[PDB]
């Protein structure tokens, strides 16, 4: 009972690019949105958020910590104090802590990305969501409906409790 | 038709790490290991897909062409002369071609990873075979097998056709 389709970017032998299936996938959304990504700075798809987020969407964001301040300075370039909008919530996830070879203290990444709406619907693969995605790499996502989705909400709440309030803030 | 578990690092509730299961697959190939990779320089995975190959295993490894170095930085330190084993072999694949704003033509990379075993079961999913995976990151894969494995062999061969011998060789 689940059921998956690939799509490319370059794209293949499918209609729609990665990135105009992602915004289908926001305009779609009637109650929530659950986003985990390493880096944002795509303007065409929080512009999507952001409309999802007028319409009475819940939108939760977990970015990854060290990446932060790239998304933070797309929205201010914007003209949006995206901490304003109260159906959004913004939170950094930080990888494991380690000593390196000179025993300094260091966190690595969270390196997980996927879209998940409405309880219903995941993007899972390895498409970023910067320019680079667009122009200059070879990307794939899963587009999964069915029982899998359930672990992909478990997975989105256990890292939503690790998560933080970002210290930009 | 298509069954789907998953795995993190750190690890869960399973019992085997994401490495621990990379090499059971491996260990368990009977014809054919077919392998696409970001960055490999983890020395026991390597020795494991070495082994495997001197057992009458076919082996094809795709790398991403700017990360390349970093595994023949490996093999040579560990004393081998990789291009000299005939049932492995090894090629580059590259991103797309675009050109800077300076006029330089540069290509991005390919952002790909999953092992295919046997025409029968694929580990898809964000790991690398790298140290950082195992000390610093977070990280998860899926482990499937039935009719999806079907789409990564294609894809897979699709990716075979586009690769190049690596310029070292
Ligand atoms: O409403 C949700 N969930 C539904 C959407 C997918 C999984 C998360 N959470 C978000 C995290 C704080 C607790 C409520
Ligand atoms: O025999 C294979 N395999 C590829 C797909 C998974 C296993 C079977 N190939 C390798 C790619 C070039 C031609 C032969």
């Not at 880096?39 to 798809?45: E, Q």
């Not at 200059?136 to 587009?143: C, D, G, K, R, Y």
């Amino acid at each position: 009972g689940t059921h998956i389709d690939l799509l490319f970017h370059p794209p293949r032998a499918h209609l729609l690019t990665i990135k105009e299936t992602i915004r289908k996938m926001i305009k779609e959304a009637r109650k929530v949105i659950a986003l985990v990504m390493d880096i944002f700075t795509d303007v065409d798809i929080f512009k999507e958020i952001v409309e999802a987020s007028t319409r009475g969407v819940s939108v939760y964001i977990l970015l990854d910590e060290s990446n932060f301040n790239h998304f933070l300075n797309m929205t201010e370039k914007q003209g949006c104090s995206v901490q304003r909008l109260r159906n959004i919530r913004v939170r950094t996830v930080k990888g494991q802590d380690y000593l390196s070879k000179t025993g300094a203290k260091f966190h690595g990444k969270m390196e997980q990305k996927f879209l998940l709406v409405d309880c219903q619907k995941v993007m899972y693969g390895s498409y970023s969501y910067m320019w680079s995605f667009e122009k200059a790499h070879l990307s794939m996502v899963q587009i999964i409906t069915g029982q899998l989705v359930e672990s992909f909400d478990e997975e989105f709440r256990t890292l939503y409790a690790r998560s933080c309030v970002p210290s930009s803030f």
